[PDB]
Design a protein around this ligand. Structure first.
Ligand SMILES: CCCCCCCCCCCCCCCCCC(=O)OC[C@H](COP(=O)([O-])OCC(O)COP(=O)([O-])OC[C@@H](COC(=O)CCCCCCCCCCCCCCCCC)OC(=O)CCCCCCCCCCCCCCCCC)OC(=O)CCCCCCCCCCCCCCCCC
Ligand SMILES: CCCCCCCCCCCCCCCCCC(=O)OC[C@H](COP(=O)([O-])OCC(O)COP(=O)([O-])OC[C@@H](COC(=O)CCCCCCCCCCCCCCCCC)OC(=O)CCCCCCCCCCCCCCCCC)OC(=O)CCCCCCCCCCCCCCCCC
Ligand SMILES: CCCCCCCCCCCCCCCCCC(=O)OC[C@H](COP(=O)([O-])OCC(O)COP(=O)([O-])OC[C@@H](COC(=O)CCCCCCCCCCCCCCCCC)OC(=O)CCCCCCCCCCCCCCCCC)OC(=O)CCCCCCCCCCCCCCCCC
Ligand SMILES: CCCCCCCCCCCCCCCCC[C@@H](O)O[C@H](CO[C@H](O)CCCCCCCCCCCCCCC)COP(=O)(O)OCC[N+](C)(C)C
Ligand SMILES: CCCCCCCC/C=C/CCCCCCCC(=O)OC[C@H](COP(=O)(O)OCCN)OC(=O)CCCCCCC/C=C/CCCCCCCC
Ligand SMILES: CCCCCCCC/C=C\CCCCCCCC(=O)OC[C@H](COP(=O)(O)OCCN)OC(=O)CCCCCCC/C=C\CCCCCCCC
Ligand SMILES: CCCCCCCC/C=C\CCCCCCCC(=O)O[C@H](COC(=O)CCCCCCC/C=C/CCCCCCCC)COP(=O)(O)OCCN
Lengths: 459, 178, 156, 128, 606
């Protein structure tokens, strides 16, 4: 695992020793090389995980997330360099350093064998994101957004720390292998109920769960493009990964402790899909769609079936890629017209046809068109829910209908109709933007040929 | 579409508009030309029955009763011209209309083709740039201090003057731009 | 260049506050009327008439032709609901609450008649179709080790 | 005479059927003139920037900014805890959650109790 | 190896070659539409051969060529079903598509994006082939959504027009309403039968419960535009005429009927679902036929005709006659495509006019179009020994001789009357009488593409019924003994419709004017279904989405409870704690109080 971590660390002195006009080129090239190297972790053994050492291990769940992070870094660099052109060399190097530190913390988080190290890195991811949002955000609400993002996370995460140290004291270990092999049932008691809550609420708020999701629109809208990319693509999946790791020791309590969370997730996915229908800001719609998809992931994790975990893993990967692509698409238009209002710029298909094609493909993947992996995950989760209870199909179908509705609503509003007359500064699409959209979309379609790479350990 | 609207419609304008709407809906009801002509002359006679009324109150009441009759007896599916706001071809060619400022963003290799067109476009741009200040000055001169009262614009009055605010009216893309 | 006092504020109660709000939204003080002062959060925004964009004049020279809106004019609170790609409030030839009666009556009549016809089906004056081998007992699932009851058909 | 047309929310009253536009007073004409003057002044202000050769960019519209700010940022500062607001919030917030909890809990309790009886017909159900 | 499988797969494979060449140089030239048309014609003539093999020996096959993924005990493979349905429907669809693309080469000549139009048509054809030939439910869902998305893209071809975008979104909404039931069926089948493939499902479901069949029925109603989800098909006429002729007339809109036919072994084991299908089909066909007879737009009338024929397919499915329904699909494709083609030629000749009130005497001005439309109308009305006879009259005969709902039978007969009614309306208002179009005559139908394509579909509409009926094995027990008056019921109904519609159409020449009746207003405004269902639920949904979900909960109460309460409480506590006057007197008084407490509440407890 050091063969991935050490080059990521080497990215720091390499970008701090580069010339003022070569930082983007060097960082992009070596980030792509690191992603290529990290692609070798997909070879999984089946029966058990790849245990490199006492500190790190790789699973069929961790490997797609690691590859997604390593692949997302170069796309973040490509998206960032346009709006940072006027910045000084030192501040651009600091921004790239923030991105590299975030990547390092993420790659170490997904491979830790022990839960305290996972917690330490999972909290350490906060600082670079907070710095990025509050320093390179564009509006004045970035400060309030950063405060929300920090405190919503910490209020859930601190009880997790207390629960983890208590569990290590009572059991003697927190190593995930020992945790799994020496699992014992949780009795029906108030102490066990509060232990369950302390082990669950941090990952709940990172998803986010409906009712604890208010930080996400603020943080995702007010962050720069790279910050939004990493928030939607990767940082939302930390909660799901933590849930999959932690629910091993929570049985059989989850059988009834999951009822309020399932109810909240289903009704709130309906609510957020409905909210997307009346939104004046283009980024907030994407944020709320992310909330709905993560609510579906929460249901999948809560029901505790192999098909549910497979669908949840597929949906996490697909949602990460699709949300990153949608955020980049919105950012291109924002850079054109310097406003996030959806109806300001209309009929962009007449002026930008290839970008309209990218918009159409992203909208089609957002509504989970077959045989894309988005629908693979969603269908697996829906089938698992149907096995859990036949009445879930009503809510699943309603959510599907509303998702198609607002996806095509966004597409029609932004791309169709007639152009706004007074707006006359819409230049032809750059090679960088088209390449960024292609690099987002092509892995999505290529993953359809080999769906088992992202289905997870339960495959 | 081309004329600045007035603050209100007179009784005469409302009367003519009701006449035209009634005739069009009667034509919708009367498909054939001869029957439509017969009933249109009958409508014209009934309409001229109160042509020379001097009491404005009773004329207004007649207009209100006629409007109620038209609304009750209108055609639910009146004939609409294809390019009209309700027609089947209303906004069909809007996707083919590209604004003229997009031609400035063309690559020099694209402008290598069509050289005379772009030379004439340069001529038009010089004309607009050399007329804009005079247009603004004329608009400032011919405007009451309390702002304009209507959406009407004055014509050119000097030797080499162009009517103010003419660029986006003259440079419409087309009705069939492709 | 939109300064602080050009943004919506709280509900106006004094007449001078109402005049200032009406001037801010480019409206006549006689026409400007805010939403009722409950806790719903409307604040200073004017309550425009609930007409759709489809009802506006299509022959007028709008700044935004598709939108049927003019630059700088106050925008309805529910514009995105009335964009004419969506909910339409245009007057209909037949009154509302009259179309509802006809539609509901048609559907209810058809449902009741279908139920009645289910009670009173149509058929031909024939006997049930007859099949040779114990009503094809071995064919319709088999289980050939339980000796089905003899289904015997006679000529007539 | 003829049957009357009555308007509603989703099918409004036509202008030609509106008694307001047929009962005219001089103050009504003055109001119409004032509205037309406001519209004309806004149109002139927009068209002076639209036709400017020098101007490049998006012409900012104050009205759109006001609409977006009112729909997004101005809502909470104008919120008051009110019996109407409190009751509507409680209903639309927690009513559906408890309704769905009751429905799902009843269905799953029936299914589990029917499983314990040994009567569910779970033949061929090897995927979950 | 048996050539059957190779030819069946090659027919589907060669259709994708122009899609691969879409990035090549030929896509930039004006030769692309002819290239696509030639490719489709070659696909048709290639598909003709497996049809001959089946007609000789009844050869049927399934090809699980590629393994995609395996989840535990469940295997997902790219599998194609090549039974009678596939080998019969593929050549018909290819023939119709060939004719319609040859028509489009003329109709869409002045469109600047004709290459994109032909590419979209080919993509729709590929997705429909995937839908038809699928052997498992996942592949059929892929084809389902592919044809749905292609319909969305083709309806909104003129994306600068608001109504086209609105109609495309409406179609998507209704199709997803049906897709809810499709997904329910998929989930039930996987959970209870451990398979998505057709073979396992048939074996494990001897007595199929109601849930999967109701899901399939909901999906079919969504795709075939039945009474609950009908209005999107008439509004799909916003697209160009070739799109209406191909997608929304004869090929795509039969997907729900085809889905119900694919599961007929399960459908015949349940009578409640059969009754529901029969009743839904009857109400759909009669409601749409009633709406058709008062419409003035020709495309709307033909679309309502298509909806009524789909309802007839549903009723013939409901009486447990699936092979007859498939035969009706194949027969109806020919003359419905021809009817849209004739309507499009008329529209193009009269300067893009679609209202029949401005269509005058074209019986002499457009002789070939008049002949083709008359032949198509006679085929639609079930004139004996035409294409429509061999299926529609057998359907009426089987409906008459079955243990069926009486109301459904009566509504089917009334719809049979209304069919001739609106056919007579179309002919009378479009081809007879005096001209009513603008004086500048542009009428010209002397183009080889239009004539050749309409001629090909005319030969089809004349002979396909006899040929196909005589070249297939008997899959339905014939009704040989029926009363004479009941044998002639369809013809009596058709003649009554002809006579009465012609009488009411002849009465409009009279110089007499009367206000419309309430029944006419109900019929013309489509029963007020789009007037209410497109306004009330949408308004309520969007209003609750803004006022309650967005504002009341996220912006107000969820803000109030967790973050704002915390901020307020901490601010109040900070103000209380930190606002001290700086006087040592008060501090030392508090120190004395604290000392007194520690010595008593703590020092006495040990
Ligand atoms: C199914 C057909 C099979 C064909 C075989 C060959 C296909 C090769 C395509 C490769 C993938 C396409 C890449 C997408 C990026 C866009 C490229 C672009 O920018 O165009 C530039 C290029 C240059 O054009 P231009 O003149 O310069 O101007 C273009 C303008 O910008 C505007 O031009 P435009 O308006 O025409 O837009 C471009 C085009 C491109 O935009 C797209 O949206 C195309 C992508 C499809 C939707 C993607 C998400 C949906 C989920 C499906 C995931 C499938 C993944 C499978 C594996 C893929 C491997 C990478 O959009 C469309 O044509 C309409 C989209 C509707 C697609 C509906 C298909 C639904 C599912 C069909 C079956 C899928 C599974 C196959 C197997 C099923 C069982 C047998 O245009 C093209 O070449 C058009 C692309 C060809 C259309 C492909 C549509 C179907 C292919 C789907 C995946 C292929 C599966 C292969 C497996 C075997 C079968
Ligand atoms: C994750 C999804 C989303 C979840 C989160 C979102 C949703 C949850 C959070 C947001 C919604 C919850 C909000 C909680 C209420 C907050 C009230 C507030 O902030 O007031 C400050 C605010 C400021 O104080 P202030 O400025 O000093 O006062 C001046 C007033 O404005 C001057 O006003 P006034 O003098 O004109 O009127 C005041 C007066 C008169 O008030 C009125 O005129 C209206 C009547 C209010 C009280 C009775 C309600 C009448 C209508 C409904 C009756 C119940 C129907 C049945 C309910 C169950 C159905 C199965 O007050 C009363 O007479 C009330 C007496 C109490 C009798 C009934 C007590 C029932 C307790 C709860 C029963 C329902 C339990 C839930 C059942 C769920 C089953 C599944 O005071 C108010 O203006 C509101 C007063 C009325 C409050 C009524 C609350 C009803 C809503 C249910 C409360 C239970 C939920 C909370 C649980 C914890 C409770 C201990
Ligand atoms: C021995 C057995 C053999 C039996 C042989 C026949 C048996 C008897 C047949 C007689 C039945 C119908 C005869 C023709 C009807 C109309 C003729 C007529 O008088 O014209 C004047 C007039 C037409 O209006 P208009 O003001 O002249 O048009 C204005 C301009 O002319 C506008 O001009 P335009 O330029 O716009 O175009 C004019 C256009 C438009 O013309 C229209 O406006 C007519 C549209 C509606 C009438 C069409 C009749 C279809 C009725 C089907 C209803 C099924 C049940 C639905 C239940 C609804 C419940 C609310 O006309 C056409 O082009 C064609 C129209 C229809 C021609 C074909 C009709 C024949 C099919 C029906 C009979 C079936 C024959 C075989 C029997 C099969 C089984 C034995 O008709 C009426 O005023 C009343 C129509 C009667 C409809 C009643 C619906 C039945 C159910 C009522 C409700 C029952 C329950 C009680 C209430 C609920 C209690 C809770
Ligand atoms: C906006 C979103 C925020 C996040 C949402 C988080 C959801 C947290 C809710 C936790 C789920 C349930 C918690 C415990 C399960 C049962 C709770 C209790 O009501 O059940 C009964 C418990 O009986 C009584 O109800 C005791 C609880 C009563 C006191 C709790 C106060 C509840 C009021 C609601 C306050 C809101 C809490 C959330 C604040 C934000 C069962 O009866 P019994 O079999 O005998 O006891 C079982 C426990 N034993 C085995 C140890 C004996
Ligand atoms: C089972 C789950 C689903 C059941 C249905 C629940 C209700 C669905 C509510 C959907 C709300 C979506 C609103 C957002 C859409 C945006 C606004 C919009 O679409 O505008 C309406 C738009 C424009 O109207 P036009 O008349 O076509 O305009 C043309 C001239 N201008 O038209 C539409 O698309 C509206 C569609 C609304 C459909 C709602 C009614 C559906 C009811 C179905 C019940 C019947 C079930 C079928 C039974 C089958 C038998 C088993
Ligand atoms: C084009 C130019 C190439 C022409 C020369 C090639 C000549 C023949 C060579 C045959 C290739 C050799 C071969 O078939 O080996 C088997 C080889 C791998 O073994 P499999 O188990 O079948 O699949 C992998 C997963 N198990 O099969 C292949 O991959 C080749 C044939 C694949 C057919 C093409 C796939 C079509 C579907 C496209 C994807 C659609 C999305 C998935 C939909 C799922 C539907 C349920
Ligand atoms: C930003 C929003 C996120 C909010 C999430 C907050 C919820 C976190 C879950 C509860 C936190 C406290 C958990 C304590 C750590 C668990 C360790 C444990 O299991 O020890 C228990 C101790 O259990 C407790 O003490 C729990 C009491 C609660 C203390 C603080 C209460 C604060 C409010 C609790 C309810 C809210 C939690 C869920 C709300 C989620 C957010 C709304 C038993 O130990 P013993 O004493 O040895 O008993 C066995 C031998 N006799």
């Amino acid at each position: 695992m050091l063969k991935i971590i050490i080059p990521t660390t080497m990215l720091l002195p390499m970008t701090w020793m580069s010339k003022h006009n070569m930082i983007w080129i060097n960082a992009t090239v070596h980030s792509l090389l690191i992603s290529l190297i990290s692609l070798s972790l997909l070879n999984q053994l089946g029966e058990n995980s790849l245990n490199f050492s006492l500190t790190f291990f790789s699973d069929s769940l961790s490997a797609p997330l690691l590859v997604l992070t390593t692949w997302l870094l170069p796309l973040m660099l490509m998206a960032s360099q346009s709006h940072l052109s006027k910045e000084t060399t030192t501040r651009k190097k600091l921004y790239i350093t923030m991105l590299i530190l975030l990547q390092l913390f993420l790659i170490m988080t997904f491979t830790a064998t022990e839960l305290i190290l996972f917690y330490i890195l999972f909290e350490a991811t906060l600082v670079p994101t907070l710095i990025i949002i509050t320093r390179w955000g564009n509006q004045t609400e970035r400060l309030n957004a950063g405060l929300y993002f920090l405190f919503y996370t910490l209020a859930g995460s601190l009880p997790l720390l207390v629960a983890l140290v208590y569990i290590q004291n009572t059991t003697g270990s927190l190593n995930f292998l020992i945790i799994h092999y020496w699992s014992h049932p949780l009795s029906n008691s108030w102490s066990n109920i509060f232990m369950w809550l302390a082990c669950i609420m941090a990952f709940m708020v990172k998803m986010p769960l409906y009712g604890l999701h208010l930080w996400l629109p603020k943080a995702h809208v007010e962050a720069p493009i790279a910050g939004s990319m990493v928030l939607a693509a990767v940082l939302l999946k930390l909660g799901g990964y933590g849930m999959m790791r932690i629910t091993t020791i929570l049985n059989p309590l989850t059988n009834y402790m999951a009822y309020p969370f399932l109810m909240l997730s289903m009704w709130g996915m309906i609510m957020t899909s409905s909210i997307c229908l009346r939104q004046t800001d283009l980024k907030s719609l994407i944020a709320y769609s992310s909330v709905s998809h993560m609510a579906l992931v929460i249901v999948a994790i809560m029901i505790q079936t192999p098909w549910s975990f497979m669908g949840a893993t597929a949906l996490m990967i697909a949602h990460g890629l699709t949300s990153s692509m949608l955020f980049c698409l919105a950012n291109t238009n924002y850079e054109r017209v310097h406003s996030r209002t959806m109806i300001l710029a209309r009929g962009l298909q007449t002026l930008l046809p290839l970008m309209a094609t990218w918009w159409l493909v992203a909208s089609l993947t957002n509504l989970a068109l077959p045989p894309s992996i988005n629908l693979i995950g969603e269908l697996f989760i829906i089938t698992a829910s149907f096995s859990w209870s036949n009445i879930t199909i009503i809510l699943m179908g309603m959510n599907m209908m509303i998702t198609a509705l607002y996806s095509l609503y966004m597409l029609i509003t932004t791309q169709r109709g007639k152009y706004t007359h007074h707006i006359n500064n819409i230049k032809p699409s750059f090679t960088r933007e088209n390449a960024l959209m292609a690099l987002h979309i092509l892995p999505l379609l290529l993953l359809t040929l080999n769906p088992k790479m992202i289905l997870g350990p339960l495959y | 579409a081309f004329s600045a609207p007035a603050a209100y419609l007179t009784h005469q304008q409302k009367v003519l508009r009701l006449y035209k709407r009634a005739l069009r809906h009667l034509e919708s009801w009367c498909v054939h030309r001869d029957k439509y002509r017969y009933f249109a002359c009958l409508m014209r006679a009934r309409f001229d029955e109160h042509k020379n009324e001097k009491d404005m109150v009773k004329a207004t009441q007649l207009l209100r009763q006629a409007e109620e009759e038209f609304w009750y007896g209108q055609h639910p599916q009146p004939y609409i011209f294809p390019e009209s706001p309700g027609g089947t071809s209303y906004e069909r060619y809007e996707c083919y209309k590209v604004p003229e400022w997009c031609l400035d963003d063309w690559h020099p290799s694209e402008k290598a083709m069509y050289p005379d067109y772009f030379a004439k476009r340069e001529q038009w741009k010089r004309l607009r740039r050399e007329s804009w200040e005079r247009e603004v000055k004329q608009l400032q001169e011919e405007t009451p201090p309390g702002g304009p009262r209507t959406e009407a614009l004055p014509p050119a009055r000097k030797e080499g003057d162009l009517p103010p605010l003419w660029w986006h009216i003259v440079t419409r893309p087309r009705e069939r731009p492709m | 260049h939109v300064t602080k006092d050009m943004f919506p504020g709280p509900y106006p109660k004094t007449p001078e506050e109402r005049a200032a709000a009406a001037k801010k939204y480019n409206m006549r003080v006689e026409d400007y009327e805010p939403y009722p002062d409950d806790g719903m959060g409307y604040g200073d925004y004017p309550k425009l008439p609930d007409r759709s964009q489809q009802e506006r004049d299509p022959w007028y020279d709008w700044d935004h032709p598709d939108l049927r809106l003019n630059w700088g004019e106050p925008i309805h609170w529910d514009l995105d609901m009335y964009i004419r790609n969506r909910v339409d409030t245009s007057p209909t030839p037949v009154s509302w609450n009259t179309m509802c009666k006809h539609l509901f009556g048609f559907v209810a009549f058809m449902l009741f008649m279908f139920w009645v016809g289910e009670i009173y089906p149509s058929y031909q004056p024939v006997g049930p179709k007859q099949y040779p081998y114990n009503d094809l007992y071995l064919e319709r699932g088999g289980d050939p080790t339980k000796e089905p009851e003899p289904v015997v058909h006679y000529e007539i | 005479s003829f049957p009357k047309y009555k308007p509603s929310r989703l099918a409004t009253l036509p202008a030609t059927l509106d008694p307001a536009e047929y009962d005219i007073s001089p103050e009504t004409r003055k109001a119409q003139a004032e509205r037309l003057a406001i519209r004309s002044r806004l149109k002139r202000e927009y068209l002076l920037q639209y036709n400017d050769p020098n101007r490049l960019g998006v012409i900012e519209d104050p009205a759109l900014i006001r609409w977006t700010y009112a729909r997004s940022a101005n809502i909470y500062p104008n919120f008051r805890p009110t019996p109407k607001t409190s009751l509507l919030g409680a209903l639309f917030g927690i009513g559906p959650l408890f309704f769905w909890y009751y429905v799902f809990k009843t269905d799953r309790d029936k299914k589990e109790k029917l499983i314990q009886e040994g009567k569910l017909d779970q033949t061929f159900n090897i995927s979950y | 190896m048996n050539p059957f499988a190779s030819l069946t797969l090659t027919t589907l494979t060669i259709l994708t070659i122009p899609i691969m060449m879409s990035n090549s140089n030929i896509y930039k030239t004006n030769l692309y539409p002819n290239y696509v048309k030639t490719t489709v014609s070659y696909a048709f003539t290639l598909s003709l051969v497996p049809l001959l093999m089946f007609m000789h020996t009844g050869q049927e096959m399934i090809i699980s060529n590629w393994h995609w993924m395996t989840l535990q005990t469940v295997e997902l493979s790219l599998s194609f079903k090549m039974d009678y349905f596939s080998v019969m429907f593929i050549p018909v669809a290819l023939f119709v598509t060939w004719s319609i693309m040859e028509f489009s080469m003329w109709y869409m000549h002045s469109d600047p994006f004709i290459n994109r139009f032909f590419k979209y048509l080919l993509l729709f054809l590929i997705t429909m082939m995937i839908l038809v030939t699928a052997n498992n439910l996942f592949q059929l869902f892929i084809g389902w959504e592919g044809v749905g998305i292609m319909s969305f893209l083709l309806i909104g071809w003129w994306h600068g027009r608001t109504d086209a975008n609105t109609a495309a979104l409406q179609a998507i909404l209704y199709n997803r309403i049906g897709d809810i039931g499709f997904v329910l069926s998929m989930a039930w089948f996987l959970t209870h039968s451990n398979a998505w493939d057709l073979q396992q499902i048939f074996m494990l479901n001897n007595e199929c419960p109601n849930m999967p069949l109701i899901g399939l029925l909901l999906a079919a109603a969504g795709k075939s535009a039945q009474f609950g989800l009908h209005p999107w098909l008439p509004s799909a006429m916003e697209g160009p005429t070739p799109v209406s002729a191909l997608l929304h007339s004869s090929t795509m809109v039969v997907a729900g009927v085809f889905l119900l036919i694919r599961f007929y072994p399960l459908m015949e084991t349940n009578k409640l679902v059969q009754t529901m299908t029969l009743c839904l089909g009857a109400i759909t066909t009669l409601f749409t036929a009633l709406c058709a007879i008062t419409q003035n737009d020709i495309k709307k009338i033909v679309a309502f005709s298509t909806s009524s024929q789909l309802g007839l397919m549903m009723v013939t499915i409901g009486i447990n006659q699936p092979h007859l329904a498939f035969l009706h699909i194949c027969m109806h494709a020919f003359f419905k495509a021809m009817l849209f083609m004739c309507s499009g030629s008329i529209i193009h000749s009269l300067n893009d006019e679609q209202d029949i009130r401005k269509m005058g005497g074209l019986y002499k001005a457009m002789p070939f179009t008049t002949t083709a439309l008359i032949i198509g109308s006679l085929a639609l009305t079930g004139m004996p020994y035409l294409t429509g006879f061999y299926s529609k009259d057998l359907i009426i005969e089987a409906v008459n001789m079955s243990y069926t709902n009486a109301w459904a039978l009566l509504m089917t007969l009334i719809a049979t009357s209304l069919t001739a009614a609106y056919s007579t309306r179309i002919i009378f208002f479009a081809f007879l009488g005096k001209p009513r179009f603008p004086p500048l005559v542009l009428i010209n139908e002397n183009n080889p593409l239009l004539i050749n394509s309409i001629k090909r579909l005319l030969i089809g509409s004349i002979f396909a019924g006899f040929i196909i009926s005589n070249n297939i094995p008997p899959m339905t027990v014939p009704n040989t003994t029926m009363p004479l008056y009941m044998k002639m019921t369809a013809l009596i109904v058709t003649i009554m419709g002809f006579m009465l519609a012609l009488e009411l159409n002849n009465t409009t020449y009279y110089l007499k004017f009367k206000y419309p009746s309430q029944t006419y207003k109900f019929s013309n405004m489509l029963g007020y279904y789009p007037s209410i269902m497109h306004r009330l639920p949408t308004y309520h949904n969007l209003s609750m989405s803004q006022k309650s979900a967005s504002s009341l909960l996220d912006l107000i109460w969820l803000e109030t409870i967790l973050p704002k309460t915390t901020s307020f409480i901490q601010m109040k506590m900070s103000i209380m704690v930190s606002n001290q006057k700086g006087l040592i007197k008060l501090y030392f008084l508090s120190f004395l109080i604290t000392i007194m407490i520690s010595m008593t509440l703590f020092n006495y407890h040990e």
